[PDB]
Amino acid sequence: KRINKELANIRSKFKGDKALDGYSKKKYVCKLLFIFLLGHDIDFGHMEAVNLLSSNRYTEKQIGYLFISVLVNSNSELIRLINNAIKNDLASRNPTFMGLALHCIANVGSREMAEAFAGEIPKILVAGDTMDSVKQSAALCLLRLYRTSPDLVPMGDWTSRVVHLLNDQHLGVVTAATSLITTLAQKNPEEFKTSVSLAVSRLSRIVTSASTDLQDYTYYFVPAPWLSVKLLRLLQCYPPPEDPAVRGRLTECLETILNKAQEPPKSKKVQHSNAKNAVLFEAISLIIHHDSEPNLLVRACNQLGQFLQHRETNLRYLALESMCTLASSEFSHEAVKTHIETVINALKTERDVSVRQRAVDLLYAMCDRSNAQQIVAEMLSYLETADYSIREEIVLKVAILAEKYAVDYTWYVDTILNLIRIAGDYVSEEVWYRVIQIVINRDDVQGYAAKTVFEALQAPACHENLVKVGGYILGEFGNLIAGDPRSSPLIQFNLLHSKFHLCSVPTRALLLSTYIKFVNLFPEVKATIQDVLRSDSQLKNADVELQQRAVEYLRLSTVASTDILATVLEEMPPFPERESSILAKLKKKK
């Protein structure tokens, strides 16, 4: 309707080669971009605007640059003319045109443009004749080209000039060079080792300044919060300095950061509060990642403990987020474990799902030997009323904690059975692999696990994973509960034969192995199970797994040699020591 009328008006403006003007064509491209903002696709004559980039009108040139940035196609001659205009603007002395070309490179990300302009852009970045606004775009453009193609980035001799960028009076160049060096330090630490000692002095000159300096780079009476966060995140990607003077200067800077955090606020603005707490949280993350100063670690743990009692939910989120590696320490581990009841209360009294997820992650991280049963019970009470989207990670974390911290495995089998009963559809396969491996490996929870899963299978609303676990556990240890009148082999077969029909394909595959183990175990139960194996619903089934299982078990039950049958269907030897497949699944998931 209206979009069709707008497309008809755009075609009437530019369909053929009618008599138009430069400002009329600029207004037509602006109207086409406004129609593209409403959700309409049109590509009528991109060359008429791509060839217009060599003009002198800055507004029309920027409109054409935005058009070729938002509608970057796979054209050959148009992209060649665009790269030629980019090289002409880079060779020109126009800083606005050079910055527009650098923004077009950093937003395009073409492989041919990255292979062509891989050498000129650091030469522009180290060019002292350029303005300060060009370097801050060029360093981020080189960062974008390095993130696009890291192999096509040389380690030239301009590195000493790159480290020397941080000594500038203008600080946007410092921000761009910090964002460059923080990415390049993961491959070249020795090429930017002196940048650590320069950035320490830069951070000291920032945080030891009053309100007189930094007349434009301040933010709500906070001196340079983004630059301080960038410098601390740069120092987090480096080891602590071996020089004692640099170490003491860094310690004094972090002490002044903590003292400014403990200071009362000047204004009442929440923007000032966020811009002051951001540097505090990045300094806390630096202190925790270093883990070198216990005097700093104790103060940071006390600061986060007092920060957890705050009223702002998006502050309590960060207070729970920045403590996972703090729980992994050794000296301040008791100071982390002082507020486990506060973490449990934050998990109970809830206002946000991601806040609850961060509380779950912090409880799982700090769970070493504090209260394993209490942590597992609180996790299960959270899981009983959790969401239906992130339940699998919580199930794997409960399984990891239960298989890790357990002195007697009876509580472990009860925990796995409660986890299977409460939302067993999200239980991954590694959990019910692991409980079978642990029950086979241990030799004092076998009869208890068999009786517990036999009582758990008698519920009408059983889940499929419970049928699998109970099937293999009964097929392995049906002999140890044969004396009880409530657990005869006839009932042991009849419960699984009731659960066999309306369940799924691997369940029906596993219960047939359980059936042939029952035929091997109890000669009283051989007749009915042999009739079930001889039935046509098992023989003529369309599934190859069930057909092969039923056919070869019917043939194996009637070879008239009980010695070979007992030699084949004997007791299973235990599993070898694996390497925590549940942990591998959790690492592949998260």
């Binding site: 204004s267 009442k268 603005k269 929440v270 009223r311």
Partner: protein, 133 residues
């Protein structure tokens, strides 16, 4: 003057009888009971009373409790009512972004938008002396 400075915010002894008289002068001048609350309008009103009458910046101290905000110092006749903005108001294409309907909401510790409103019931007796110690 005062109304223009308050609507441009889109991004001696402290005697109680003189404060009552100045609140009545503000209400008859058409400056309040229709606008919202922010720290900039707080500082503008304080600087305006200090410029036009030479008043010490001590009177404007409102309660920090959740809900209705009353003046703590005696004499000021302007309480604050927590205005819950309707869903059809925060959807207009001409509402200002940096405006205390969406800027002052993040700043209060309870997260409630505040506006101004006259209350002549507090002209009889105190409220902060019997509400909070």
């Amino acid at each position: 003057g005062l109304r223009e400075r308050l609507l441009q915010a889109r991004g001696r002894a402290m005697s109680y009888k003189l404060a009552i008289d100045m609140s009545h002068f503000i209400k008859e001048k058409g400056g309040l009971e229709g606008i919202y609350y922010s720290d900039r309008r707080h500082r503008i009103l304080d600087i305006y009373l200090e410029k036009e009458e030479g008043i010490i910046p001590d009177w404007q101290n409102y309660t920090s409790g959740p809900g209705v905000r009353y003046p703590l110092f005696f004499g000021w006749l302007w309480k604050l009512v927590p205005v819950n903005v309707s869903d059809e108001a925060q959807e207009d294409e001409t509402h200002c972004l940096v405006h205390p309907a969406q800027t002052s909401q993040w700043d209060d510790p309870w997260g409630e938008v505040l506006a101004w409103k006259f209350d002549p019931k507090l002209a009889y007796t105190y409220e902060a002396f019997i509400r909070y110690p």
